[PDB]
Design a protein around this ligand. Structure first.
Ligand SMILES: *CCC(=O)N1CN(C(=O)CC*)CN(C(=O)CC*)C1
Ligand SMILES: *CCC(=O)N1CN(C(=O)CC*)CN(C(=O)CC*)C1
Lengths: 591, 17, 596, 17
């Protein structure tokens, strides 16, 4: 009975969903107030059709539904569309929501040294927090950003919590955090179920195993940063938060120049090759498509090459320059990426193309089931590709790298140390943030000590010390995009641990021999059919069964990640043998 | 929060969709 | 038409047939509980079924109206009740199993009989056989035989069923987007979206705990003394530094130490405060005791009982002809119909029970002012706390003297005072650590912190660490010691007893301040106080129309449960007990056992 | 699965309702 109901929805949703996606793409490609007008016009249409369908599905009992796939479908609609919130409060939130997003995008700080010269995070402040080597220059940027944009968000955040919880609890969820964690929840599949509490455990247990690895990178980076900032860094204390190559130390990738193990060794810079062979965007995307075809995967549809924007369209039309793969539907797929001839963009292209591959694979799934098994699955599917392509082997197989090079090990430490500055560094950051938010939702943290706790936790879990005392007037947590734009952040913990689990499995299927950090799945029908098997499922099955289908494991595991960095581990340990490791939480640069 | 994603990024909430 | 109105049209149509069915069911239920007959059961069932059906169809129809589109605060609450309490969340077959599990789990606690080894044919049931020994017997071996016979001859029949129950219960709770069945249960104490009076399900766990940590000093010092005396009754069985064997506590589970007064009385020389003799010598009877209760309530400004109450109630055992269920029970049949079932007896304990049961009838009538759906208590711990505040005042020497059951020349001495408080603690401070641990276990079990491979092991680890009560014989996972209690085997929450206790002392602390009481709170009689009766009546009428946190503030001047009152009540005991044990060991070895 | 309590006791689930 409800089956037919779905058919109707599926048929109409497609035509409606497509217009909405196109309107958003068009606006992103061409920022026209009219594009917004159609986008918002369509936006309102879907928000209605869906809400309209919700009650219609709510008119059916999942209990009676014996068929499983249909139940999973029905689940979504009914578990959505409800306002479950006072029209007055609903408006109060949507406002606060959009207000905080704007203050982040519009936020601007003015150098008291040039009270005229003001910089936005993108790209003025970010450029200083990615490249500068002056304590005072880097400090003003980090502080001013929080001493202005953050303090302003603070009371928006406070009410955010309040209205957010009320909606969550109105749905029987302990708090907003427990709602977000419901992303991972499974119920009804014997031997594949999962609890919104298991996660908070599975994440703290696994992190215990990472603490050591991290402890030395932190000890090594500090060892090095000491040469750069001698009068501002202690051998025993935490890392000042403003010297970590971001606004927030999300990643330390921009510290590789100051933390390169073996300096005069062959700096990997395939970007120069790409120049010296007059490369272009078509080459980058085409090169990738071959790799996907090399593993037994379909070729990009023509619409991709004709509808995608892989270059900045000049001053004649402005666009949202953020690498992004799009699943519009009716078989339409596209990539918006202001591409440039750099290895970074080279690798990013594969990452985005992987999302496309995933979208194309689960495209056959019922409309509702066309989504990643969980929030971290898609991000991982793209990371594994940029991981295979970063391999010296593929670079030669591509011939951006001359077959003169000696894999060596000084080079493997150079390759792993950098991979770590971006993959491991984020985990102490990812974890402690999603914790601190999770606690604030459960209400374990009083408003009066929201920042004191935030920095106690930074100092303790991430060995990072705010360089200026921060009162409870600030909202440093919200000085980061994801926080102030109401997006979960434990995707960037689950994907980082899922990625290594898939690679190891695929490499074993590819009969790869030796270290995993050198595994290029390029040319492996088996390591492709297995991955595809998972992508095709989408969300038709629990993420637990999918992970096992691929990696033979039902839950996340750090071993694969620990194996990938093990060689670095040993080198680090040795390198810190005279060095003290860990940090004294009760030291700060204002000491 | 929303049934189907039309893309793979997380875009600012102001001018979103 | 408007939704808020289409709603009215529906609720108005619903509340019409609701009032009729609820009575039809509440009536046949009474007819059975008083005269157990095949027809009375059939009628009871046929009724409860028709109602359960009406509620289900109405619960579904109700969801059709969303709440965000209703501004009227009252029809909102009503709808939330019908919509939220819409069961059938589980599949028809799964539902059918959990029900059969519950029926079988109850059939076996009630039908459970332990066979005296002496008579492989003779066998005893919990009531009356086994409870009598576990309440009066002073033979370590005879008390242990029953204690084990209960968990090893019935508890083991439950272990398998309770495991399946924990599964289906968690499926249903999680389907409602609830973390577990324990979180669903804390659901009762939850208030969402009332600026100033909001309560999370997790605040209850934080509140049950932080309050308990303040009780530690007292129960520790009571424990010390009780252990010191029990030694003199069992000098070959009791470590001067250990837990109390779980069979030697005056209960089958040790829930109350009320029956250990004969061995714990501080001054047995002092005269008893029981007046069953006076009641007998004055030829009192059920009618007299209940009439004496109505007078206390009228003394405070509350209404007199109804005519149907003195006409349809059963305050005396029907006899052999009519077979009845003698459990102190206050009914609300709907349509201004209120009755009490009690096979009353001429005793001080049955006199005080009536005051408690009558407080329930006062409440049931107090909120008839509310619509059918808000015609309930603020929380599962409110109705009990009410009935208890009466018996707290009714059993005061002031009240007894003025009822003419205690000589007007009686002497309230420190010595008689302490006999009272102590007996109070054995029943009050004692059941607290017992209740906290039991639920704390069930929560952890439903949450998933405790694997089935260590259910019983954790049960006794907790009993030792929290309750300073050790098992006399070691128990594997074949046992279900917790399930050996009616509440657990009958699917009932238990924290209601932790909560009600804290509220009652806060209520008395205030209702007395209202009666301008001078000195120690334990000798406070609110009788003849209209001001106090009004303040309580203010909350009594609210019923299930406002946040329990508000109901509390209306009578206390504060919005959350608080223990400082309870601590002031027993403060004279605490101070004396510290002194008593000055030459005794306080606290306990978790590790020591009888079988070491 | 019950809004109004038809009395103040916790009766045996067996034979009740
Ligand atoms: C259905 C919503 C969705 O696709 N996403 C969540 N989200 C937003 O709500 C944007 C306003 C971030 N996403 C995107 O920006 C689309 C790629 C994903
Ligand atoms: C609405 C259900 C109800 O009133 N109660 C459930 N119950 C049962 O025994 C149902 C089989 C225990 N209750 C009572 O004892 C009421 C007299 C409460």
């Amino acid at each position: 009975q409800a089956k037919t109901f779905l058919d109707k929805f599926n048929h109409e949703a497609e035509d409606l969903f497509y217009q909405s996606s196109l309107a958003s793409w068009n606006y992103n490609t061409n920022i026209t107030e009219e594009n917004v007008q159609n986008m918002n016009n369509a936006g309102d249409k879907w928000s209605a059709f869906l809400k309209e369908q919700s009650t219609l599905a709510q008119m059916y009992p999942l209990q009676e539904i014996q068929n499983l796939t249909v139940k999973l479908q029905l689940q979504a609609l009914q578990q959505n569309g409800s306002s479950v919130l006072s029209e007055d409060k609903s408006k109060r939130l949507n406002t606060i929501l959009n207000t905080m997003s704007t203050i982040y995008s519009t936020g601007k700080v003015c150098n008291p040294d040039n009270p005229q010269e003001c910089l936005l995070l993108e790209p003025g402040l970010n450029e200083i927090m990615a490249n500068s080597l002056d304590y005072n220059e880097r400090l003003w940027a980090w502080e001013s950003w929080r001493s202005e944009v953050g303090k302003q968000l603070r009371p928006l955040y406070e009410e955010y919590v309040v209205l957010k919880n009320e909606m969550a609890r109105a749905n029987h969820y302990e708090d907003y955090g427990d709602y977000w964690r419901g992303d991972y929840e499974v119920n009804g599949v014997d031997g594949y179920d999962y609890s919104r509490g298991q996660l908070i455990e599975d994440v703290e247990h696994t992190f215990e195993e990472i603490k050591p690895l991290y402890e030395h990178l932190h000890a090594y980076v500090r060892a090095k940063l000491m040469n750069a900032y001698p009068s501002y860094i202690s051998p025993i204390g935490c890392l000042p938060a403003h010297l970590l190559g971001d606004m927030w130390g999300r990643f330390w990738t921009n510290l590789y120049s100051l933390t390169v193990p073996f300096g005069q060794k062959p700096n990997i810079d395939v970007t120069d090759a790409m120049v010296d062979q007059a490369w272009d965007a078509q080459r980058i995307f085409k090169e990738a498509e071959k790799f996907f075809v090399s593993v037994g995967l379909p070729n990009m549809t023509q619409g991709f090459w004709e509808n995608s924007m892989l270059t900045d369209p000049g001053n004649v039309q402005k666009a949202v320059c953020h690498p992004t793969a799009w699943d519009l539907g009716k078989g339409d797929f596209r990539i918006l990426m202001c591409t440039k001839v750099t290895m970074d963009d080279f690798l990013t292209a594969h990452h985005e193309m992987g999302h496309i591959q995933y979208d194309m694979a689960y495209a056959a799934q019922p409309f509702l089931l066309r989504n990643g098994a969980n929030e971290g699955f898609h991000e991982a599917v793209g990371e594994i590709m940029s991981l295979s392509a970063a391999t010296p082997k593929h670079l030669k197989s591509i011939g951006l790298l001359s077959p003169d090079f000696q894999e060596d090990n000084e080079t493997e430490i150079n390759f792993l140390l950098k991979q770590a500055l971006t993959i491991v560094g984020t985990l102490p950051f990812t974890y402690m943030l999603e914790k601190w938010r999770w606690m604030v939702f459960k209400g374990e943290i009083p408003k009066d000590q929201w920042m004191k706790k935030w920095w106690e936790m930074k100092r303790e879990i991430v060995g990072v010390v705010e360089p200026v005392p921060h009162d409870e007037t600030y909202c440093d947590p919200a000085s980061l995009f994801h926080v102030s734009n109401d997006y979960s952040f434990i995707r960037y913990y689950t994907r980082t641990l899922y990625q290594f689990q898939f690679q190891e499995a695929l490499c074993q299927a590819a009969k790869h021999e030796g270290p995993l950090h050198k595994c290029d799945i390029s040319n492996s029908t088996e390591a492709g059919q297995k991955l595809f098997n998972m992508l095709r499922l989408g969300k038709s099955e629990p993420w637990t069964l999918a992970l096992e289908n691929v990696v033979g494991a039902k839950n996340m595991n750090v071993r694969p990640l620990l194996n990938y960095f093990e060689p670095l581990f040993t080198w680090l340990k040795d390198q810190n043998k005279n060095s003290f490791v860990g940090w004294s939480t009760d030291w700060s640069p204002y000491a | 929060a929303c049934v189907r994603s039309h893309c793979s990024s997380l875009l600012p909430r102001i001018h979103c969709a």
